[PDB]
TrEMBL record, chain A:
The lineage of its organism: Bacteria, Bacillati, Bacillota, Bacilli, Bacillales. It comes from the Bacteria. The gene is uncD. ATP binds at residues 157-164, 351. Belongs to the ATPase alpha/beta chains family. It catalyses: 4 Na(+)(in) + ATP + H2O = 4 Na(+)(out) + ADP + phosphate + H(+); ATP + H2O + 4 H(+)(in) = ADP + phosphate + 5 H(+)(out). Mg(2+) 1 binds at residue 164. Mg(2+) 2 binds at residues 164, 193. ADP binds at residues 160-165, 340. This is ATP synthase subunit beta.
TrEMBL record, chain B:
It comes from Bacillus sp. (strain PS3). ATP 2 binds at residues 234-236, 484. This is ATP synthase subunit alpha. It is a peripheral membrane protein. Belongs to the ATPase alpha/beta chains family.
Length: 470, 563, 79, 78
């Protein structure tokens, strides 16, 4: 019926039950205690079962601080894993790991629908047999690093390159075109940046189509390693019930794995290489296999990854890099010169850039642009600098078209219209292929470079140069 | 002792059973306790130590309910009478967690046996202690709780084996995962079986044609060899494997593809790629994706090679591909650490070299007395930042018969495949080649070796006009010839003829930017007016007369218009 | 005539693929029929188990006790 | 040449789509007929299974009473 506390060693607790009444693994248990005198404090705690040790004892991990616990307290078995609310009631609100609102707009009614946090991955016979391309509406992404429905993308960048603007633009474009929602999960990051993102999303207006879950540095190891699953189960409902295409953003996947190690040794497990838990790839696989493209809808996830000390051979980045399909690199150099977004065109990679996926025309145009940019990068540095400038023919034209193509990858976003009068554009992929091909052929070689700046389709560029006096 | 009955038993019956079992076993005196649990229906099940005797309803009844799934015929012939007593050797779980379990009992269980849990999940006994058994669970473990019951099956680990597996997708236990219905086989083969002996073999002479010019010319592979493909991620090794698998359409081979620790979406797309090219008439796919329990990932390669050996020991030729041998090692390390076995370098167990050598030594070429079959193995190993000094990469390099190296620098620039001939070796050598390829490949090897030294100094011309820019031009022409595109493998006669044209100085006039189109149009030309050189190479295995070859290449060049 | 020959080959390959698809659809129908037969048999078996349990419960146990004791004794003798 | 290849590709795609549509219609009709036959066989084989269940109980251990009791139990279960 009810268990009692045996040991309290940090974030790990031991509970003893009656014979033949042990809870299953992954269940949730509750401690609710009121002080009986001045030598006691009130307790409201949730625990998750981890191991069966034998002799009617189980070892559990706490979801909050364990200060104030007493050997002999009474524990209640809930009967099921952690359950979070799902549906339209979670749109525009902020939750914690247990599925409780941390804003001040009220509580979800107890007569709602709640889904468990742990479930198996979709089976082989109900996956997508074809690779499909996701239409974002950006120009550099849709040309040099296309995204995939149900894929995983690694976003590389930090401060001063503006990745929150890219996040908001993706949310807005996907919601407007494909009618999808977004879920943001912050896993063990700074609280200041979470507040900043919440207020930016409130200002833009993309909050009403997003659900936010936060578990950050201040929280125990147990809460940091079970918060991505709450966002995942909030997102899966829309794919499996409304048949939508959803986006899932993860603030730091690395922290997830890190949190696991912080409890592994306390559970009584021998260490593996570099002091990591023996069950590392299994945990990462059980997480990342639940986001796929089934026959109804799809979940595509953008994940930000921090590499410790820029060491890419560390077990955690090495394990998580085998699940990624594309990478998107944001560079400060392009942000200084006024290219928005600051996506690096020569360092962004994708596995969808192949003639059998996008097409022959797309592939040829993209490869021509890439080699032109590489030629510019090689030539402009060792030559034309240090007083070795020269004006060879076919080198005037190469830099002419390269400069006219580098500035056409910039775009005007809808979320940036609050600081700038331009409404913003959504450019399909055929249009940008046509525009880049036309620029490559030299048809638009008789215009100044200022016309190719913060513009959508190629034709609009002409109108710009019409009003510039040229 | 303990008796479970629907209703409590009479004293006379209890005494009779006690006397009967005391006489049968040979014990001094038995104290029999009975229960009144109505879970059974007018029957009793008895437990002597860890032995269960079952003669109750929902016992033998289920024994005929589970069987026969004519119905009235069995109901009146064999289902009416109990199918004897259901005897089992049981145990009791005492610890559960992380995918393993420990139990009390199972006195006569073997090492490596298969046990069945109460709810229907399987497990494999791997640690026989003095008073408990360590069991690794081959499935979901959240339904297993302390106090459960385990039973022995009596069979060492084994997999289904037959010709019905061709064109199907299965998991390491031999169960379909493509949803096309059951697989109808009639044989089994133990997963752990010995390798053919020293005197049961024969030297490797026949070639394995892949269709990739760089491999077929510089790193040849023979039937019965074990070649390693090593490189970082984002280098395209699965494409090499898939092209090799596709090329075997009319070469009388059976292919097996094992995917360990990959994504299910990528496995699905790979199977769909295989189906489109009609490569599912001779291929078997075994899959253990990243969300599966660690024992399945550790057991998949052995299942693949066990299915291959059945064809091997009947005179056929097989080719087995292992998607990653590092994921299997990591899974085995996890299992070993969870079972409290002493660790080693990078926490790997002591027998981690044994685990891979015992598997890779089952690929052989059999002698004429044993049939003449063969089995070729192509394991994959993935490195981080191009570091081949690591424990597993050095372990697998020292077992195989040579390695193929793929670089990440060449992949990004656009060189497909990104093979490096400066670090790739094949110890079988030219014995796995045809006479024409032997006569043609040496000059190509020497030319590439010469060009690789001076490739980095092309920025500074004005070098020795005699033999520096000539070697640069020859090397660039060589590098352009070795490029290729996804799918579309090339026949060996065409490869021989184009490499002959390159090495004899027939390509200097053609500029570097037109070499690919030149070779494509040459292939088109040979299909019409070169219909006898190809047949001569196919039938004789030696390249045709030099004067005829020169005249044919001279005739083609007059038509090819150079831009 | 090379283009026309390739066109004819592609058309014949497409027709062969269509025939294979129709055969696979027939095989899917056969698999569904086998699954339906199995499901019907399993439902019949479950209903039979329930009916037999009810009938056995309704049946008297005076002779059933002696018969069960004799059968258990015979089982002990056998093993 | 290129035009001939494009026409061949269009014809092949159209033929494959037509065969797929025919297969889909056949599969839908087969599924409907299979559902009807499954319902009819469920009823008939349920009566037969009640009779055979009385028979199996007798074998493990008049006919009209047993059949009526089995039918009543089946109705209660359903
Ligand atoms: Mg690869």
């Amino acid at each position: 019926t009810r268990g009692r506390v045996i040991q309290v060693m940090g974030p790990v607790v031991d509970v003893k039950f009656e014979n033949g009444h042990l809870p299953a693994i992954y269940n949730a248990l509750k401690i609710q205690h009121k002080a009986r005198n001045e030598n006691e404090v009130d307790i409201d705690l949730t625990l998750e079962v981890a191991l069966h040790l034998g002799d009617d004892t189980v070892r559990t991990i706490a979801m909050a601080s364990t200060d104030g616990l007493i050997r002999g307290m009474e524990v209640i078995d809930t009967g099921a894993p952690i359950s979070v609310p799902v549906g339209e009631v979670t749109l525009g609100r902020v939750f914690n790991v247990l599925g409780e609102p941390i804003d001040l707009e009220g509580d979800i009614p107890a007569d709602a629908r709640r889904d468990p946090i742990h479930r198996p991955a979709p089976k082989f016979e109900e996956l997508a047999t074809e690779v499909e391309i996701l239409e974002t509406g950006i120009k550099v992404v849709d040309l040099l690093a296309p995204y995939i429905k149900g894929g995983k993308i690694g976003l590389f960048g930090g401060a001063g390159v503006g990745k929150t603007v890219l996040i908001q633009e993706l949310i807005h474009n996907i919601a407007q075109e494909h009618g999808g929602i977004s879920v943001f999960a912050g896993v063990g990051e700074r609280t200041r940046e979470g507040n900043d993102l919440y207020h930016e999303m409130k200002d833009s207006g993309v909050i009403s189509k997003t659900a936010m879950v936060f578990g950050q540095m201040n929280e125990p190891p147990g809460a940091r390693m079970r918060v991505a699953l709450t966002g995942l189960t909030m997102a899966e409902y829309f794919r499996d019930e409304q048949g939508q295409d959803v986006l899932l953003f993860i603030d730091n996947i690395f922290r997830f794995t890190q949190a696991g190690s912080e409890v592994s040794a306390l559970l009584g497990r021998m260490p593996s290489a570099v002091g990591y838990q023996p069950t590392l790839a299994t945990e990462m696989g059980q997480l990342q296999e639940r986001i796929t493209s089934t026959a109804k809808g799809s979940i595509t996830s953008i994940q930000a990854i921090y590499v410790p000390a820029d060491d890419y051979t560390d077990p955690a980045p090495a394990t998580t890099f085998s699940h990624l399909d594309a990478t998107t690199n944001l560079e400060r150099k392009l942000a200084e010169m006024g290219i928005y977004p600051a996506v690096d065109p020569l360092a962004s990679t994708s596995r969808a850039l192949a003639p059998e996926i996008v097409g022959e025309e797309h592939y040829q145009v993209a490869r021509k642009v890439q080699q032109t940019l590489q030629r510019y990068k090689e030539l402009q540095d060792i030559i034309a600098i240090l007083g070795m400038d020269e004006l060879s023919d076919e080198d005037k034209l190469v830099v002419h078209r390269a400069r006219r193509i580098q500035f056409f990858l910039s775009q005007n976003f809808h979320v940036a219209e609050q600081f700038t009068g331009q409404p913003g554009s959504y450019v399909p992929v055929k249009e940008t292929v046509r525009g880049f091909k036309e620029i490559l052929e030299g048809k638009y070689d008789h215009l100044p470079e200022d016309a190719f700046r913060l513009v959508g389709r190629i034709e609009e560029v002409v109108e710009k140069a019409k009003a510039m006096g040229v | 002792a303990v008796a479970y009955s629907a209703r409590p038993l009479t004293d006379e019956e209890l005494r009779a059973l006690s006397d009967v079992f005391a006489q049968k076993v040979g014990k001094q005196t038995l104290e029999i306790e009975n229960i009144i649990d109505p879970e059974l229906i007018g029957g009793v099940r008895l437990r002597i130590g860890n032995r269960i005797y079952d003669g109750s309803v929902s016992g033998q009844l289920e024994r005929i309910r589970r069987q026969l799934i004519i119905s009235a015929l069995i109901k009146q012939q064999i289902e009416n009478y109990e199918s004897q007593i259901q005897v089992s050797d049981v145990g009791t779980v005492i610890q559960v967690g992380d995918g393993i379990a420990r139990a009390h009992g199972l006195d006569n269980v073997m090492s490596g046996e298969l046990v069945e849990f109460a709810n229907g999940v399987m497990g494999m006994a791997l640690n026989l202690e003095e008073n408990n058994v360590g069991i690794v669970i081959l499935g979901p473990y959240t339904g297993i709780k302390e106090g459960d019951e385990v039973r022995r099956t009596g069979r060492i680990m084994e997999v289904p084996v037959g010709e019905a597996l061709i064109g199907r997708v299965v998991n390491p236990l031999g169960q379909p995962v493509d949803g096309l219905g059951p697989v109808e086989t009639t044989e089994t083969r133990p997963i752990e079986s010995p390798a053919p002996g020293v005197m049961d073999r024969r030297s490797v002479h026949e070639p394995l044609q892949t269709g990739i010019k760089a491999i077929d010319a510089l790193v040849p592979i023979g039937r019965g060899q074990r070649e390693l493909i090593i490189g970082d991620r984002q280098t395209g090794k699965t494409s090499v494997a898939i092209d090799t698998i596709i090329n075997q359409k009319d070469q009388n081979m059976i292919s097996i593809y094992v995917a360990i620790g990959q994504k299910e979406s990528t496995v699905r797309t790979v199977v769909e790629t295989l189906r489109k090219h009609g490569a599912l008439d001779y291929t078997i796919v075994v899959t253990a994706s990243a969300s599966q329990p660690a024992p399945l990932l550790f057991l998949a390669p052995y299942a693949g090679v066990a299915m291959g050996e059945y064809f091997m020991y009947k005179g056929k030729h097989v080719l087995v591909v292992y998607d990653d041998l590092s994921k299997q090692a990591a899974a085995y390390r996890e299992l070993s650490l969870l079972l409290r076995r002493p660790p080693g370098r990078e926490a790997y167990p002591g027998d981690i070299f044994y685990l891979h050598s015992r598997l890779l030594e089952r690929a052989a070429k059999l002698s004429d007395a044993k049939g003449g079959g063969s089995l070729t193995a192509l394991p994959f190993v993935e490195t981080q930042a191009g570091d081949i000094s690591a424990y597993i990469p050095t372990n697998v390099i020292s077992i195989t018969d040579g390695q193929i190296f793929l670089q990440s620098d060449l992949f990004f620039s656009g060189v497909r495949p990104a093979i490096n001939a400066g670090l790739s070796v094949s110890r079988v050598g030219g014995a796995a080649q045809i006479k024409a390829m032997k006569k043609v490949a040496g000059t190509l090897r020497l030319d590439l070796a010469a060009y690789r030294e001076l490739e980095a100094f092309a920025q500074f011309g004005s070098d020795l006009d005699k033999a520096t820019q000539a070697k640069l031009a020859r090397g660039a022409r060589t590098v352009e010839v070795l490029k290729q595109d996804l799918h579309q493998p090339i026949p060996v006669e065409k490869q021989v003829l184009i490499i002959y044209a390159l090495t004899r100085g027939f390509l200097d006039d053609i500029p570097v930017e037109d070499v690919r189109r030149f070779e494509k149009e040459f292939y088109l030309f040979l299909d019409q007016n070169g219909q006898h050189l190809l047949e001569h190479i196919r039938t004789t295995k030696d390249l045709p007369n030099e004067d005829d070859l020169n005249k044919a290449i001279e005739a083609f060049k007059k038509t090819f218009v150079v831009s | 005539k090379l283009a026309e020959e390739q066109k004819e080959q592609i058309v014949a390959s497409a027709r062969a693929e269509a025939e294979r698809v129709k055969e696979t659809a027939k095989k899917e129908i056969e698999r569904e029929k086998e699954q339906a037969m199995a499901a019907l048999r399993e439902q019949v078996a479950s209903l039979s188990v329930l009916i037999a349990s009810k009938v056995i419960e309704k049946e008297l146990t005076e002779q059933d006790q002696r018969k069960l004791i004799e059968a258990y004794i015979k089982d002990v003798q056998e093993v």
